[PDB]
């Protein structure tokens, strides 16, 4: 039965955990907005091989996932959960948190995302051969950017994307339920202080994040068919563990 003071402290703690495990500082991200890939550089990426483009993207996603694991490790109550549940939560949610986190690196003015040093549009990713997935990812980020999240709101929202008591396989279910509820209280408390509670009805329906992760696993099945050795030899082992079927 968390007090209002304990809830306020939870807001601060989560926001701190997030800031500390942010890959990119928001100021650096902003100071690079006009730094956009040229026609020539975009052509360079489009001309790359499928295997090369996948290998690069797999590396970047894995790096992002590493930061999310660190976020979990610093998140109030997460490390108090049993080993099984920490794993169940991360397996189901790490990619979802990365997808939400991406909106920090997404400039909605020109529909570009910070990728390998500059801002590129989704046409940079053509060689992947998964345009519906890539475009779905860009649309998700765009729809999120329409909410104009603050760093604090992202911190709280991602905590909730991760701490989901309905993940199949949890063993201390009531313990996860309690953490999710307190995080919901913290989120709703922070929103009301800023009169931003209206965003809640505008958050992505959970099916959306699920369809994105599912598309990624499917497109990887197809890539792996075409290039079985690349995955074993070149892809980060964590990536392989989390996404290969």
């Amino acid at each position: 039965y968390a007090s209002l003071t304990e809830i306020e402290h939870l807001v601060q703690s989560v926001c701190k955990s997030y800031r500390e495990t942010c890959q990119l500082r928001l100021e650096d991200l902003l100071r690079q907005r006009s730094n956009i890939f040229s026609r020539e550089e975009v052509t360079g990426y489009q001309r790359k091989s499928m295997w090369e483009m996948w290998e690069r993207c797999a590396h970047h996603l894995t790096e992002a996932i590493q930061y999310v694991v660190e976020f979990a490790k610093r998140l109030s109550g997460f490390m108090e959960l049993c080993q099984n549940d920490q794993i169940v939560l991360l397996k189901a949610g790490a990619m979802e948190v990365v997808l939400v986190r991406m909106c920090r690196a997404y400039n909605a003015d020109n529909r570009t995302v910070f990728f390998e040093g500059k801002y590129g549009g989704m046409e940079l990713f053509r060689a992947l051969g998964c345009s519906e997935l890539i475009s779905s990812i860009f649309d998700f980020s765009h729809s999120l950017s329409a909410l104009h999240f603050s760093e604090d709101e992202i911190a709280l929202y991602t905590a909730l994307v991760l701490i989901n008591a309905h993940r199949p396989g949890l063993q201390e279910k009531r313990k996860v339920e309690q953490l999710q509820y307190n995080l919901e209280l913290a989120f709703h408390h922070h929103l009301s202080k800023t009169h931003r509670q209206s965003i809640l009805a505008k958050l992505p329906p959970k099916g959306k994040l699920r369809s994105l992760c599912s598309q990624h696993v499917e497109r990887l099945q197809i890539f792996q068919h075409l290039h079985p050795i690349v995955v074993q030899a070149a892809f980060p082992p964590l990536y392989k563990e989390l996404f290969s079927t």
Partner: peptide, 9 residues
């Protein structure tokens, strides 16, 4: 698993 090791288990 790798997740376990990363969690410090």
């Amino acid at each position: 698993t790798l997740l376990q090791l990363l969690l410090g288990h």
